[PDB]
């Protein structure tokens, strides 16, 4: 009970979000930041991404999926600026 257009959006989201999340996780870990310290810019960002990823994309409308896709495009851009001072 799904559409190709939405499942295609989900596939792209899954690949993009992985890339963005990994970039932030990698920095937090190679930098020995306390993952339990939300005051740190990078950890706070990591926690926001964790919250964003916990969702079930199969329960979103096409419009919502396109929004999630833009969310990750925006975080892809943002994470690059935050990590690469």
């Amino acid at each position: 009970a799904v559409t190709y257009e939405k499942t295609f959006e989900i596939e792209i989201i899954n690949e993009l979000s992985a890339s963005v999340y990994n970039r932030v996780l990698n920095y937090v870990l190679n930098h020995e930041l306390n993952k339990n310290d939300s005051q740190l810019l990078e950890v706070n960002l990591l926690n926001q991404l964790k919250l964003a990823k916990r969702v079930n994309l199969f329960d979103y409308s096409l419009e919502e999926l396109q929004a999630v896709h833009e969310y990750w495009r925006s975080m892809n851009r943002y994470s690059k600026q935050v990590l690469n001072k």
Binding site: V2, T7, F8, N14, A18, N22, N26, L29, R54
Partner: protein
Amino acid sequence: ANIVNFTDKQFENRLNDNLEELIQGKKAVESPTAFLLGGQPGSGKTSLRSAIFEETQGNVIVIDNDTFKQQHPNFDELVKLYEKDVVKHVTPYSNRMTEAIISRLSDQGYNLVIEGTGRTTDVPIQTATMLQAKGYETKMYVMAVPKINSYLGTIERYETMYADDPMTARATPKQAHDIVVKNLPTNLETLHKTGLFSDIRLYNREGVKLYSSLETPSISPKETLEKELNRKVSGKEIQPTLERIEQKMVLNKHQETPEFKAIQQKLESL
């Protein structure tokens, strides 16, 4: 060796975060089930994930090797050295991480979905056998999609990823797509004969079940899959996709490619 390598501690820290992320909202069960996926690149295996998520009422973890590649501890340095050809350097890490996660999660008894193409039979047989030894029931859900539609899908996926990030976007070799298309039918019959899978299913992009070995034990998955793979797609059905891809390629400045030119002709030929 050297930078392409990593310490057990770096591996461990990543494994722990991966596990933390994957088990969120999930719970181990008494009689776990593992769903091995199959289907050529571009077929749209995400549709299988939807069907399985529904079947397990959401209590299932998806293990996708690709999601760990850019997680290599030294990914940044590796990229500066190899740029677009970095993939081959981090695949070993991803492979090890994937096997570590499957091992840990299967030890605990979570229902699992294992991303795969079914290009070979040895990999799924090996996985299923290992899992059954841990008390798992094993199924194999596979996409049955016309080769022309999946091929166009690999192109659209690439162009879309390119639009998102020109840096990391990389096309799916048509050879990789064609090799799965060619071997999958025969491979499923081979898997059918092993009796390792309680049910082998074929699905289309809308999540419609087209075949089930559990439902028709004596019917091989082979012929049904071949029929779909070779089905002639009407211009009416294909035109929309062609135009959508065409427009994305123009935006990406990819008109000077055999792919774009072929889409133009196949399109103007309508």
